[PDB]
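Margin note from the TA: students keep mixing up input and output lines. Inputs are the sequences; the output is the structure of the whole complex. Example:
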Amino acid sequence: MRAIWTGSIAFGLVNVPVKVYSATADHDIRFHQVHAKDNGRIRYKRVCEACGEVVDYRDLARAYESGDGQMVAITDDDIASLPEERSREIEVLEFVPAADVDPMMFDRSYFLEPDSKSSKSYVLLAKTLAETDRMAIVHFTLRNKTRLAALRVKDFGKREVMMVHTLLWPDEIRDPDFPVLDQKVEIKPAELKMAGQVVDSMADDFNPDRYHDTYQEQLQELIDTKL
Amino acid sequence: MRAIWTGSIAFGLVNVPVKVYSATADHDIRFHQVHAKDNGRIRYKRVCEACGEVVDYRDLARAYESGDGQMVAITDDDIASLPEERSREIEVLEFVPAADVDPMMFDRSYFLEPDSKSSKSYVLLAKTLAETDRMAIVHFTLRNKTRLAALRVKDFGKREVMMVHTLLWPDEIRDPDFPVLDQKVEIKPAELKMAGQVVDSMADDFNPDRYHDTYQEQLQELIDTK
Amino acid sequence: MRAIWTGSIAFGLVNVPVKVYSATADHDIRFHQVHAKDNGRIRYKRVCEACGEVVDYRDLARAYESGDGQMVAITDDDIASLPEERSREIEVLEFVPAADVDPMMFDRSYFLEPDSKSSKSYVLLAKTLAETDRMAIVHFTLRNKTRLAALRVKDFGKREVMMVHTLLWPDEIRDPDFPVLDQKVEIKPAELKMAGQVVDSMADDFNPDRYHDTYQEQLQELIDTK
Amino acid sequence: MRAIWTGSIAFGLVNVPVKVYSATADHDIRFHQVHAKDNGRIRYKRVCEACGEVVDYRDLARAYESGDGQMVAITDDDIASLPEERSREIEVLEFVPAADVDPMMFDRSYFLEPDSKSSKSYVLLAKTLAETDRMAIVHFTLRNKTRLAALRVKDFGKREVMMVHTLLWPDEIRDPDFPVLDQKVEIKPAELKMAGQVVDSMADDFNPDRYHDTYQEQLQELIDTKL
Amino acid sequence: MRAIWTGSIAFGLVNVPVKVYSATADHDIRFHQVHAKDNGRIRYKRVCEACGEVVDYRDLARAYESGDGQMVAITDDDIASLPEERSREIEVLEFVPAADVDPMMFDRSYFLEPDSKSSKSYVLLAKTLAETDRMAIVHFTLRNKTRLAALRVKDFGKREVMMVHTLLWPDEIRDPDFPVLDQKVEIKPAELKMAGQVVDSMADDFNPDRYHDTYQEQLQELIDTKL
Amino acid sequence: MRAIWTGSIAFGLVNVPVKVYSATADHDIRFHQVHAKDNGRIRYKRVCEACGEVVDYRDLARAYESGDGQMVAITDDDIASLPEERSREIEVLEFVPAADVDPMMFDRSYFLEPDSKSSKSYVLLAKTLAETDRMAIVHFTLRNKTRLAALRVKDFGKREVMMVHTLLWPDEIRDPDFPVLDQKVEIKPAELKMAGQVVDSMADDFNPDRYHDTYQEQLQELIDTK
DNA sequence: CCCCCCTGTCGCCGCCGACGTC
DNA sequence: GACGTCGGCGGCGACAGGGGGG
DNA sequence: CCCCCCTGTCGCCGCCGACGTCTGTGATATGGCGTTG
DNA sequence: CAACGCCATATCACAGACGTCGGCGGCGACAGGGGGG
């Protein structure tokens, strides 16, 4: 366990400290690319095609490939123009109910953990959010990149915790083109009840215990057999 | 927009052809790495460690490195032991009410559209799912990988589109293993009632049109100047 | 310098890390007890009246003497019933105008430093305090001895740092019980005129740069020579 | 309420008698150690650390340790060097406006009341100071320790007594050298206005009566319970 | 050798403390009275003019007799008409050159020995008076009886002390409006010159040493011889 | 006004009868003592204490109370040993310059007026002593009490009178033996200037007519009311 | 103090729908 | 009406810096 | 990672406040002598 | 016809100086423990 950032929520003047944690930990085994004949792992070296020589990270300049096939180098100052890089606070913008968030924009969920000294000023805000049951659209900033996100509280029975959901930009979600539904619809209700009863035939709820990653278990058994 | 893959929702006698799109595709500008002296693209090439030279990808043996570090030679017979990967159709295993679905477990959104002209089945399934309001849990099998997913509908006004939302396994969620938040800390209710209106001082509603990425717009304009 | 402690202001939702420092360092010279016969640094032993033997710090019991002088054996668990001192927060209580604290009460002055990498909340609080011109009275706690204080802001050349001034409990400030001045003495205007003349003849303006402790400098020079 | 002084303000040939009094009495309770196991009161005995024998107060020589761990015995000539302590007078130095002394410096306060016979000069000087609104910075020698101070008047309604506020030597007060605040802090204009209602929601008037040491009163009640 | 007063020279603010001392102590043979037959001391009997019985001190009352023999009753406040009786200080009034006042009015003298802590102010005042050789007129109010006096500095070589000389009221000096003084005589100059040289015939200087008390010394010899 | 006694100044072969007068006759008001309820004077009589009997003044023992509290038997011859009282004249001893004696011992002043038929003598001594300007140190005798006095000449405008001032025994001028003033204290020049300014502010001239015993005046009014 | 993990980042690899075309 | 080529679209998996905590 | 600095005790010296001791001053109330009685 | 205004003398009453004694409180130093690096 290791936090990925350390900052304070910057709403108003509150400056409540928090420690960000990644909820979705990659339990899946990460495979490696090696060659059995030499038993030595492979490495990647980038060589200019015409030059025929390897290069170091310092000599490469980022170039944006346009539709015209023209390369333009990117300067550090131009990319560095963003002033939020030095900001280590989750700059809250406004508080909104959680019912109006489109479930399509969720990207990743992080766990917020406060500082022991100021636990009083964290649990208070969490309790207020729970009582009002509202999100809080923030401007999450990490690795010199800003990811719009919403902050919401999910009670875990014993305690309350704050978590931030990275949100896709509303312009990102692509509008669909639907030339199929334009046709007239004439459905006999006689089949409506039949279909509805078919749907209700498998009436049940979530069963997390039954939901087991079969392939992951098989791979785990295989690697155990290897040893 | 070209569908990533096309298939059908095969569950017993119920079967509808479907072409699957991607609801979201990163529109952030991507740049090609170049070398200043070259002023052109640079190509990565695999090099063997002991050999000191480039070895073809086809001559590389699958392996996994654990804590012990034993040399693992993964073949194809064990990888193909799962027959689900071959299956190009997606079946509903169970049904669950919409409320039970949590916002936590969404992974990605894929748009579903039909292929044949038998639009009766599409609208019928959309209507019954909307009325029952129970999410169709599916073991999505695409890209020869199987992941849990749920199918549902939302009202576009113009369209009653049915489409899926990938899900992750319960093993992927870490627990909040820290009792610091569990400390019994009392709070003066006056503090709560004075921070209340403070919270609502900014109260508003979702306005997706207003929100945008300032950095991406700045980069777009900057490259436009270039 | 070296911080005495590191807590954080807290009134309801608001919070801000602060790092107190000592603002009055006395450069008066501390000596050590030595004896000429052997020139060895003295050592102290806790010695028992009744039992006539050395009794350790751990084996030493605290007690109290009342008006009758009866010994009272106290216990640590009972005294610790107060939970406030455990708090590591400068729990602000109210905001009041700065001019409403007579110089009777000020006891000690302490600087403040924002702890986290970002000082936005600290700077904003300092600015609002400077503008509205209001002191903030806090229940400063330190070393398990809670002591009332007050928050005020005053610029020093380059910064608008704000400081906390400890305060005396109003019941501590005595009163001038003196029936010798309430008597009225006959006086003449010429006496007032001459008194004003003599007083204002010696009047001047504060120039602290030329005020120093002659005894301290003398001792410093004497030790330097030795 | 037992005096600690009997001198006289003397700037020239004035010499108004004054009785200095402690203006801050600590109601805090001071405890006492004891060997409760055998019921034996505790006393401290000065014992050599090297030669290891108990000694009397006279023998120990006041010794100073420098960076080299030296030891110099302070003799009588050190006392003889400064003759200022031989004076029992509050030798007024200058008269300045009261506004010229900052609250940074004030250290302790005492109340001056005169010998009953010389009340005339006492009240005349206090009245002159009050009317002309002047500080009266002085010197001060209590138990052989010369401390700067300031003499300022203060009306108490029925009576008007002048008091001496001891001052810290201007060099003693520390200077805040904090580079963190020097770095530029940027705040959007709408942010600052928000805090005004936050502080205004808690504004009040300073009333001494409300505040009281709960710890001390609880301890007093507890000990009353013990008896 | 024991003091009589503890006040303070108080004009404006100078308020210099002083302990007035007696300069004219009667060294005569202070005698006592007894009776031979009883061989014991005596005591008066306060018998009325009419009661015929001894009256206690408290019961007696004050009154005055005029030419007509009437009586007057004085109340307690009547005696306290002048508030200056309550005064407990030598309230200086003015300052005059020493040579101006005639030695006619000088009635009694006293010594002023200041309080130790007030040596500076008293020394400054004495030096000031000596430099300008200026007297000072003061209402020396002692033992409830006001009395005009005069304050000046007398050198003693070792140190300078300031004494207060009581002054008789100017109206007290009887006017010699007598006719005998008016008459004048015709006087030859030669007799004036011979008389003058006769005056010089017994020239001498101030020699109080050869001056002695005859009767007092003889009584001292007698009282030494008797016992 | 009645002269206290009449004698002469007999020094050498020069004699001049004189009429001594009380120069300083106190005008302070003397009130008697009466028991108001009695309405009469309280007459005191010498009464034996040891034997408890009324004793007349003609047998009281002239006894002393020394350190041991003994008793003294005094005869007439021993107290009559001194023959000076037998003389009823003033004896001029010598002559000394007047400016070199301080007024410390000057006790009482008495007027001298001519009693001789010949006016020549009185004016002769008056003028010669006035011109020589030398004090005439003489012995004064009165009612068995002999005290020294000095004769001087004072002009009252029209009149010139030789006049006698009593003097005290040399041992009666006590000494100011006290080390408190012996201690030497440094003087600051600025304090000296301040003292000179303040004292000079009240500097004035002595006019006899201004000063009256205001208490005596108000007592006069008070008695006048009755 | 050291000393060790986590995530943008992008080039290499691979596959399947669209629409030109037989 | 039915081949099958292409092009893009996505994913795989290695890497390069960012901090975290004792 | 730590060594510094609050905080509480202790012992010590120096200082004040009340108790006890006597001593000198102002006034009453008579004498002897100048003067009248 | 030269003893009764003015000055001691007695002391009586009364207000104040001066010396002892016990207690109260600054303060210089140490010890312990916390939370800073």
